[PDB]
Design a protein around this ligand. Structure first.
Ligand SMILES: *[C@@H]1O[C@H](CO)[C@@H](O)[C@H](O)[C@H]1NC(C)=O
Ligand SMILES: *[C@@H]1O[C@H](CO)[C@@H](O)[C@H](O)[C@H]1NC(C)=O
Ligand SMILES: *[C@@H]1O[C@H](CO)[C@@H](O)[C@H](O)[C@H]1NC(C)=O
Ligand SMILES: *[C@@H]1O[C@H](CO)[C@@H](O)[C@H](O)[C@H]1NC(C)=O
Lengths: 68, 180, 49, 98
């Protein structure tokens, strides 16, 4: 007799809550973290030239401490 | 996100709308679900999906690109008590931290708000465009659906979805079924 | 001397305040004042010098 | 209720989480000292100007979006009523259905 055409959008079983200007907590299908809250725990030696002052302060090296 | 597991209002007989999302599609953000004499089907709209995704990725790139590079800076941790100068350094760093935290909060809130707003706007734009394609052959249901008053077969639905649909060649029968 | 061993979360100085003992000057007066205020106590322990 | 909830939510966002500060630099000086005092004055003035601008922008944005969302709620209600009146009614253009 007739046809039906419905328009819609994708959803996910459980999204992630985000803040907005209006809603303090609103669900979205996908979100990304913008705060890097974790560290490798090690200082990569590149590309910056890292110099390890194992047992020496910079001033001790400057003056010429025997163990520096 | 508006999930729709349990048919949320009706049984399988009559389903599909804009008030509720669809979990049964993975090929696109926006799309159509249709019923007709030929059966039932579903498809995705690549145009609106691509536009929305492009805007989202663009704002993400704006947010993340151009990272500031800093090499030498004031001392921010102190092993001594020194008074005026140390307090001034602490205050400067704390002011910077507070201001940047507020900036991040406001930026994220604004970006999320506009993301939701532009996605809803894309959905409404798609619905409006479909409604204006269905010049008079159809009638809006209010749940995000159009009822077509003629035999809109799968070719008809494909024409509607891809934009080659012609209203006139169905106009006479559609109006007759609408009013009579 | 009424302020001996006093403690505070906010020391309020009055514009009328004055000194009535030997005249003194504190090189870097601000630093000493700020660190004493941040310490929050005048708890004084005598030592056997 | 929806509009009021959004308005109160944004108000709570604006007012909640008040910053707590206990010890700070001296901001009023009875002497003339030069470099360090000028630096302290400049730091405080920069903070004040930045926070004043932040408050101005925040209030402007919040008011703009408040008006926009209230108008959007009104239009949403009108649209919903219009779609309920599928064909029985006809829109007047002044906000009324016949
Ligand atoms: C998603 O999971 C969280 C877990 O706490 C929850 O409370 C919320 O109800 C969930 N939503 C859905 C639709 O499952
Ligand atoms: C979520 O967004 C990120 C960033 O654009 C993307 O890498 C990821 O694939 C997305 N995940 C889903 C499930 O869409
Ligand atoms: C649109 O769909 C109709 C119906 O199947 C088809 O005849 C037409 O070629 C399609 N156009 C494009 C560009 O795919
Ligand atoms: C102040 O307190 C210390 C202990 O911390 C005590 O030895 C001293 O006698 C006290 N002085 C006065 C005036 O009460």
């Amino acid at each position: 007799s007739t046809a039906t055409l419905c328009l819609g959008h994708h959803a996910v079983p459980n999204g992630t809550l985000v803040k907005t200007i209006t809603d303090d907590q609103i669900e979205v299908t996908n979100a990304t973290e913008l705060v890097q809250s974790s560290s490798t725990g090690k200082i990569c030696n590149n590309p910056h030239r890292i110099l390890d002052g194992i047992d020496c302060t910079l001033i001790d090296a400057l003056l010429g401490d025997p163990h520096c | 996100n508006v999930p729709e597991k349990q048919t949320r209002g009706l049984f399988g007989a009559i389903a599909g709308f804009i008030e509720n999302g669809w979990e049964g599609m993975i090929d696109g953000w926006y799309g159509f679900r249709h019923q007709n004499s030929e059966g039932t089907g579903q498809a995705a709209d690549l145009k609106s999906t691509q536009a929305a995704i492009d805007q989202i990725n663009g704002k993400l790139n704006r947010v993340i690109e151009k990272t500031n590079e800093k090499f030498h800076q004031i001392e921010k941790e102190f092993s001594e008590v020194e008074g005026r100068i140390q307090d001034l350094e602490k205050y400067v760093e704390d002011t910077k931290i507070d201001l940047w935290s507020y900036n991040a909060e406001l930026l994220v809130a604004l970006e999320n708000q506009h993301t939701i707003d532009l996605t809803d706007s894309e959905m409404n734009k798609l619905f409006e465009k479909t409604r204006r394609q269905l010049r008079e052959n159809a009638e809006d249901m209010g749940n995000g659906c159009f009822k077509i008053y003629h035999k809109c077969d799968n070719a008809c639905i494909e024409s509607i979805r891809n934009g080659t649909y012609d209203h006139d060649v169905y106009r006479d029968e559609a109006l007759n079924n609408r009013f009579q | 001397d009424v302020f001996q061993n006093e403690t505070w979360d906010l020391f309020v100085e009055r514009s009328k305040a004055f000194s009535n003992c030997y005249p003194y000057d504190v090189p870097d007066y601000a630093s000493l004042r700020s660190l004493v205020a941040s310490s929050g106590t005048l708890e004084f322990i005598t030592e056997g010098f």
